[PDB]
Amino acid sequence: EVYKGDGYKVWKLEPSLGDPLELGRKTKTEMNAMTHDEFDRMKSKGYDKLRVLLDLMDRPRLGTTVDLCAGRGGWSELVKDLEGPKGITAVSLWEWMADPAIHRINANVKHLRPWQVDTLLFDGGEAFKRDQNLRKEENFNDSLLDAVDAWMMQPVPPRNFVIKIQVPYTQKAIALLEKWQVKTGKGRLVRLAGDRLSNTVMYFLSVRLETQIRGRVTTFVRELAERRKDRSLTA
C-alpha cells in the first residue's frame, strides 16, 4: 500500500514550462566550466539498479529477454537469478563478468536488427567529457535511441521494457519517447534518486502511462541544475 508507491526511489517530476534543450545545454555548459573542486564535490553496479527499477514495475515476469549493451552483464545476471539463464540474450561489442551460461552476441547495437521479445532492456549511452562539442554527445546518444526504436516499433513490441535515457532533453529523445507511449500504450520516464548529479540519466519504464514527457524532462533539468549549484557551492 504505502509500500507500493514511490516513494523516495524517484524524483517527483510534474511538468513545468521551459525549453528542455536549452536548459539542458545550459547546465551542461555550467558543469563543463566548474572547477575541480565544484565538479568532484558534486559528482555490475547495475545489478542493484535494475532490481530497484523492476521492483518499481511491480516485479513482472520477464520471459524471453534481450539485454542490449549488456556490458559486464550486471542486468543479464539479475534476469538469470530471477528466472534462469535460458530466456536471456545479451548483446554488446567486445569484459563479461556474469554467468557464462548466458547466451551472448558480439554485435553493434546499431546494426543488429530486432526480433520479438517479452522484455527489452537497454543500458547503453555514454556521458562525454567536457572537452567536446555539446552536439556530439547529443548526436551519439540520439543514434543509440534510434536503434532501440526499431525494437520498440516492431509489429509485436516488448511487453516489458527498461530503457536508459542518457540524454533525455533532445528533440529526438522526447519525440522517441512520446512515439513509444503511443505504440505501446504505456511508459513513464523516471529519475532515480541517488544517481550521480554529474549525468542526466533517466529511465523509461513500462509502467502505467505518464504523459507530458516534455514538461517533466524540463522539470528534471531545471531541478538538477539547482541541485548542482547547491552541492558545488560551499559555505
Residue numbers in the entry: 42 to 84, 99 to 149, 155 to 295
Authors' text:
Alongshan virus (ALSV), a newly discovered member of unclassified Flaviviridae family, is able to infect humans. ALSV NSP1 is a typical flavivirus NS5-like protein. It carries two essential enzymatic activities: the methyltransferase (MTase) and the RNA-dependent RNA polymerase (RdRp). The flaviviral NS5-MTase functions to catalyze the methylation of viral RNA cap.
The crystal structure of apo ALSV MTase was determined using the single-wavelength anomalous dispersion method and finally refined to a resolution of 2.5 Å, with Rwork and Rfree values of 0.209 and 0.258, respectively. Clear electron densities could be observed for residues E42-K84, S99-W149 and E155-A295. Amino acids Y85-P98, E150-E154 and D296-R313, however, were unable to be traced due to high flexibility. The N-terminal extension region consists of an extended loop followed by a helix-turn-helix motif (helices A1 and A2). The core region folds into a seven stranded β-sheet (strands β1-β7) surrounded by four α helices (helices αX, αA, αD and αE), which reveals the general αβα-Rossmann-fold. The C-terminal extension region consists mainly of an α-helix (helix A3).
